Amino acid sequence: NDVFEHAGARDVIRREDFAKTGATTMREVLNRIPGVSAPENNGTGSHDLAMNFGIRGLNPRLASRSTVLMDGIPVPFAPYGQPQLSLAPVSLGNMDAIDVVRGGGAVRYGPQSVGGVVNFVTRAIPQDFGIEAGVEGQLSPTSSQNNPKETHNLMVGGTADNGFGTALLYSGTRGSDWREHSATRIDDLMLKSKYAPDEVHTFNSLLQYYDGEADMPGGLSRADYDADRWQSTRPYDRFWGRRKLASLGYQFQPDSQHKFNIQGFYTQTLRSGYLEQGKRITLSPRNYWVRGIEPRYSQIFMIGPSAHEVGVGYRYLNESTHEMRYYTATSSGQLPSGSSPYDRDTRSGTEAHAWYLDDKIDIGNWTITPGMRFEHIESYQNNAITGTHEEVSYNAPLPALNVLYHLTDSWNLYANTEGSFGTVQYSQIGKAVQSGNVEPEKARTWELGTRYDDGALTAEMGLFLINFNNQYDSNQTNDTVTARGKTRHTGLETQARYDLGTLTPTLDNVSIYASYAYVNAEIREKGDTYGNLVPFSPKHKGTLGVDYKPGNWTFNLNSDFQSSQFADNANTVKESADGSTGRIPGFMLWGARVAYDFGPQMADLNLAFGVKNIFDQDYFIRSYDDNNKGIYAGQPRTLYMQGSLKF
Ligand SMILES: CCCCCCCCCCCC[N+](C)(C)[O-]
Ligand SMILES: CCCCCCCCCCCC[N+](C)(C)[O-]
Ligand SMILES: CCCCCCCCCCCC[N+](C)(C)[O-]
Ligand SMILES: CCCCCCCCCCCC[N+](C)(C)[O-]
Ligand SMILES: CCCCCCCCCCCC[N+](C)(C)[O-]
Numbered sequence: 152n153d154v155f156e157h158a159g160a161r162d163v164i165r166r167e168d169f170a171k172t173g174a175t176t177m178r179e180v181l182n183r184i185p186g187v188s189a190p191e192n193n194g195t196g197s198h199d200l201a202m203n204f205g206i207r208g209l210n211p212r213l214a215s216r217s218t219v220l221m222d223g224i225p226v227p228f229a230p231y232g233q234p235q236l237s238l239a240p241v242s243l244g245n246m247d248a249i250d251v252v253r254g255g256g257a258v259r260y261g262p263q264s265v266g267g268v269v270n271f272v273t274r275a276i277p278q279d280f281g282i283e284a285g286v287e288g289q290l291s292p293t294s295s296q297n298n299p300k301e302t303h304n305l306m307v308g309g310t311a312d313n314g315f316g317t318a319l320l321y322s323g324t325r326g327s328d329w330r331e332h333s334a335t336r337i338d339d340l341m342l343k344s345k346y347a348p349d350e351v352h353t354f355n356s357l358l359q360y361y362d363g364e365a366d367m368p369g370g371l372s373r374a375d376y377d378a379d380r381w382q383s384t385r386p387y388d389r390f391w392g393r394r395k396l397a398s399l400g401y402q403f404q405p406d407s408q409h410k411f412n413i414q415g416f417y418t419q420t421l422r423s424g425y426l427e428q429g430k431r432i433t434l435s436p437r438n439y440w441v442r443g444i445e446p447r448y449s450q451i452f453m454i455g456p457s458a459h460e461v462g463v464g465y466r467y468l469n470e471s472t473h474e475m476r477y478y479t480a481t482s483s484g485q486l487p488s489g490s491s492p493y494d495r496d497t498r499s500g501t502e503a504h505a506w507y508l509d510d511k512i513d514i515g516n517w518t519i520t521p522g523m524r525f526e527h528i529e530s531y532q533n534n535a536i537t538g539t540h541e542e543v544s545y546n547a548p549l550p551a552l553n554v555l556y557h558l559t560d561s562w563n564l565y566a567n568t569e570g571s572f573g574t575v576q577y578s579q580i581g582k583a584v585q586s587g588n589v590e591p592e593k594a595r596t597w598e599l600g601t602r603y604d605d606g607a608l609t610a611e612m613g614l615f616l617i618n619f620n621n622q623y624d625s626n627q628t629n630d631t632v633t634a635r636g637k638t639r640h641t642g643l644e645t646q647a648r649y650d651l652g653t654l655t656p657t658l659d660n661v662s663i664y665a666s667y668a669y670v671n672a673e674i675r676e677k678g679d680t681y682g683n684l685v686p687f688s689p690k691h692k693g694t695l696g697v698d699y700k701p702g703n704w705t706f707n708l709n710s711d712f713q714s715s716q717f718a719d720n721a722n723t724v725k726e727s728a729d730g731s732t733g734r735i736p737g738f739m740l741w742g743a744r745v746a747y748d749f750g751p752q753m754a755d756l757n758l759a760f761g762v763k764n765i766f767d768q769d770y771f772i773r774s775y776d777d778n779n780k781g782i783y784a785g786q787p788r789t790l791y792m793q794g795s796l797k798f
C-alpha cells in the first residue's frame with residue numbers, strides 16, 4: 152500500500168496483470184498507465200531491443216527524460232551522458248511488477264527525474280523452491296509477415312534453510328511482428344541471489360547477461376505505404392547489442408528504528424548496428440562501462456507527538472563510453488565492417504556525486520516530507536579524429552516537498568513540488584544549437600491529487616504542472632541538435648476500477664475500469680514555434696475495459712484510444728511525401744481475451760487465447776528526425792495464445 156501512501160502521482164502494475172491484454176513487452180504494460188505514452192517501435196528504436204516511452208508529453212523517443220531503473224540499478228548504458236535506450240537490457244518476463252512514479256520521488260532518485268522514475272521489480276526468489284514458465288505467440292493475419300512472434304519466460308529458484316536463496320530468471324523473444332524485415336532474437340538471462348544468515352544482516356546480488364539482435368522495418372513514404380503498408384524499404388537496417396551486469400548489495404538492520412543499505416553495481420554494454428544514412432551505409436559500435444556505489448541510511452525517531460523518519464544518502468557513479476562509425480557507399484552493395492573507413496571516433500565520460508537528505512514527518516493526519524537532492528557532475532568528450540577535448544561540470548540543487556493528508560481511512564489527498572534536471576548529454580557537448588549553447592535542462596514540477604480505495608471502488612485523480620527551461624531533439628540525418636525552447640506540461644491524470652457485483656448478483660465477478668489523462672504540452676519558447684504543441688503528445692489518451700472472472704474462467708475486454716498528434720515542432724498538418732512530417736490521427740482500438748485455469752492446484756496450468764485490435768482498425772505513427780523516417784503501420788488484428796505453468 153506504499154503507493155496508496157505515496158505523496159504524488161504513482162502506479163504499479165503487478166505481474167498477475169500483464170497477461171490481461173496479452174502484453175508481451177514493457178511498452179504494452181506502460182501504455183495502460185495514465186499519463187504514460189509508449190509508442191510502437193519506430194525511428195532509431197524501430198525494434199524490440201530499445202524502449203520508447205515518455206510521460207506527460209515528454210519526448211517518448213528512447214525513454215530519455217525519465218530515471219529508469221531495475222531493482223534500483225540504472226538501466227541506461229549511460230545514465231548521464233546518453234540516457235537514450237536504443238538498447239534496453241530489461242524484459243517484462245523477469246519482472247514481478249512495474250513501478251512508475253511520475254511525482255513524489257526526485258530526491259532519492261536521479262538524475263533524469265523530470266519524466267518520472269520507472270523501476271522494474273525483478274521476480275522474487277522462491278521462499279522454498281518453485282518453477283514457473285510461460286509463453287505467448289502472436290500472428291498478424293492481414294499482414295504479409297508470416298513469421299510469428301513467440302516470447303517466453305522461465306523462473307527456477309528456491310531458498311536453502313541456511314538463509315541462502317538463488318533464482319534463475321530467463322526471458323526470451325523470437326520472431327517478427329506485423330512488419331517485413333523485423334525478425335528478432337532476444338535472450339535475457341539473470342542470476343539472482345540473497346543471503347540472510349540471520350535477521351539483521353542480508354546480502355543480495357544480481358547477475359545478468361542480455362544479448363539481442365533485431366532487423367528494423369523502418370518508415371515508409373506515402374506512395375509505398377499506400378501500395379503495401381507491411382513492407383520495409385530499409386533492407387540494410389539492423390540493430391544488436393549485449394549487456395553484462397553485476398550488482399552486490401548489503402543491508403544492516405539492528406532494529407526497527409535503524410536501517411543501513413549499501414549497493415554497488417557494474418554494467419558493461421555494447422550496442423551497435425547497420426543503418427542506411429544518406430548515400431552511405433554505416434556501422435556504429437558503441438561501448439559503455441558503468442560503476443557506482445551507493446550507501447544510504449534511515450533512522451526513525453519520535454519528537455513529541457510526531458514521528459520523524461530521516462533519510463540520507465549518497466551515490467558515486469562513473470561512466471565511460473567509446474563510439475565509432477564505419478561506413479561504405481550505399482551505392483555499393485557492400486555492408487560496412489571492421490577494416491572500412493570510419494568517420495567518428497569519440498570517447499566520452501561522466502563522474503557524478505549525488506547527495507540526498509529527506510525527512511518523512513507524521514503529525515496527526517499529516518505526513519510532510521521535505522527533501523533535498525544535490526548533484527555535482529563532471530563530463531568530458533574526447534574526439535580522437537578532430538582531436539578536441541571538451542569538458543563540463545555543473546551542480547544541481549533540487550529542493551522538494553511532499554505533503555499527504557489522510558482524509559479518511561481509505562481516501563488521501565496529496566501535493567508536491569520536486570526539482571529535476573537533465574544533464575548535458577555527450578552528443579551535445581559540442582553545443583551546436585541556434586539558441587547559443589546546449590543544456591543543462593532544469594525543470595520544476597507541481598502536483599495535486601487524491602487517491603481512493605474501499606474494496607469496491609478504487610479510484611484516483613490528480614493535476615500536474617511542469618516547467619522546463621529547454622528541450623533538445625536529435626535529427627540523426629544531419630547530426631545536429633534541434634532546439635525547441637522552454638516548454639510547459641499541464642494536465643490531469645485519473646483512473647478507476649469498480650466491482651459491479653456490489654450493485655447486483657447478476658454482475659457478480661464483473662469488474663469495469665477506465666484510465667484517462669488530458670495532457671497539454673506546449674512550447675513557451677519565444678519565436679516561430681511559440682504556442683505550438685510539443686510533438687508526439689496526444690491531448691487525450693486512456694483505456695477502458697471489463698474483466699469477468701466466473702469460476703476458473705477469465706474474460707477480458709478492453710479499449711485503447713487517443714487523439715491526434717504532431718510530428719515536428721512546426722506542427723505541420725499537411726503530410727510530406729516521405730511520410731515523416733504531417734498530422735498523426737487519433738484512434739480507438741478494441742481487444743478481447745478468454746482464459747481458463749485448470750485446477751488452480753495441480754500445476755497452476757493456465758491457457759488463454761485472444762485478439763488485439765478486433766476491428767482491424769487502421770492507424771499509424773511517424774518517425775520525424777531519424778534516418779528511417781516515415782509512416783509506420785500500426786498493429787492490425789493480431790491473434791495470440793498464452794500458456795502458463797507453475798510448480
Ligand atoms: C507460438 C505460439 C503458437 C500458438 C498457437 C495458437 C495460434 C495463435 C492463434 C490464437 C487464437 C485466437 N482466437 C481467439 C482468435 O482464437
Ligand atoms: C536456462 C535457459 C536459459 C537460456 C540461456 C540462453 C543463452 C544466453 C546467451 C546468448 C547467446 C546467443 N547466441 C546465439 C548469439 O550465441
Ligand atoms: C572481480 C571481483 C569484483 C571486485 C570489484 C571490487 C568491489 C569493491 C566494491 C564494493 C562493493 C560493496 N557492496 C556491498 C555495496 O556491494
Ligand atoms: C559516518 C558518516 C559518514 C558516511 C557518509 C557516507 C560517505 C559519503 C561520502 C563520500 C565523499 C565523496 N567525495 C569524493 C565526493 O568526497
Ligand atoms: C563507502 C562510500 C564509498 C564512497 C567512495 C567515494 C568514491 C570517490 C572516489 C574518487 C576517485 C575516482 N577515480 C575513479 C577517478 O579515481
Ligand SMILES: CCCCCCCCCCCC[N+](C)(C)[O-]
Pocket residue numbers: 463464506507508523524525548
Ligand atoms: C556526512 C554527511 C553530511 C554531508 C551533508 C550531505 C547531505 C546531503 C545533502 C545535499 C545538500 C548539499 N548542499 C550543501 C549542497 O546543500
Ligand SMILES: CCCCCCCCCCCC[N+](C)(C)[O-]
Pocket residue numbers: 456514515517519554
Ligand atoms: C492531537 C494533536 C494533533 C496535532 C495536530 C497538528 C497539526 C499541525 C498542522 C501541520 C500542517 C503542515 N503544513 C505545512 C503542511 O501545512
Ligand SMILES: CCCCCCCCCCCC[N+](C)(C)[O-]
Pocket residue numbers: 550551552568595618
Ligand atoms: C510553495 C512551497 C515551496 C516548496 C519548496 C520548493 C521550492 C520551490 C521554488 C522553485 C521555484 C522555481 N521557479 C524558477 C520556476 O520559479
Ligand SMILES: CCCCCCCCCCCC[N+](C)(C)[O-]
Pocket residue numbers: 554555556564565566600
Ligand atoms: C470531514 C472532515 C473534513 C476534513 C478536511 C481537512 C483536510 C485539510 C485539507 C488540506 C489537505 C491538503 N493536501 C492536498 C495537501 O492534502
Ligand SMILES: CCCCCCCCCCCC[N+](C)(C)[O-]
Pocket residue numbers: 566567595597599616618
Ligand atoms: C500551497 C502549496 C500547494 C502547491 C500548489 C502550488 C502550485 C503553484 C504553481 C505555480 C508555479 C509557477 N512557476 C512557473 C513559477 O513555477
Ligand SMILES: CCCCCCCCCCCC[N+](C)(C)[O-]
Pocket residue numbers: 562601602603605607608610611612
Ligand atoms: C461506492 C462507494 C461510495 C463511498 C461514498 C464515499 C465517497 C468518496 C468519494 C470518492 C473519491 C473519488 N476520487 C477519485 C475523486 O477521489
Ligand SMILES: CCCCCCCCCCCC[N+](C)(C)[O-]
Pocket residue numbers: 643645667669
Ligand atoms: C480551456 C482549456 C481547458 C481544457 C479542458 C480539458 C480538461 C478535460 C478533463 C476532463 C476530466 C474528466 N474526468 C471526469 C473523466 O476525469
Ligand SMILES: CCCCCCCCCCCC[N+](C)(C)[O-]
Pocket residue numbers: 656657658661697698699706707708743
Ligand atoms: C447470471 C449470469 C449472467 C451474467 C451476466 C453477464 C454480463 C457480464 C458481461 C460479460 C463480460 C464479457 N467480456 C468478454 C466482454 O468481458
Ligand SMILES: CCCCCCCCCCCC[N+](C)(C)[O-]
Pocket residue numbers: 691712713714737738739
Ligand atoms: C472536446 C474534447 C475532445 C474530446 C475527444 C476525446 C478523445 C476521444 C478519443 C479519440 C478517438 C477518435 N476516433 C474517431 C478516431 O476514434
Ligand SMILES: CCCCCCCCCCCC[N+](C)(C)[O-]
Pocket residue numbers: 745746747758759760
Ligand atoms: C475462441 C478461443 C476459446 C479458447 C478458450 C481457451 C480456454 C481453454 C478451455 C477451458 C475449458 C475448461 N473446461 C474444463 C471447463 O472444460
Ligand SMILES: CCCCCCCCCCCC[N+](C)(C)[O-]
Pocket residue numbers: 284285286303304305323794795796
Ligand atoms: C535457449 C532458448 C530455450 C528457451 C526455453 C524457455 C522455456 C520457456 C517455456 C515456456 C513453457 C510454457 N508452457 C506453459 C506452455 O509450458
Ligand SMILES: [Fe+3]
Pocket residue numbers: 195237627
Ligand atoms: Fe542514435
Ligand SMILES: [Fe+3]
Pocket residue numbers: 578627
Ligand atoms: Fe546519434
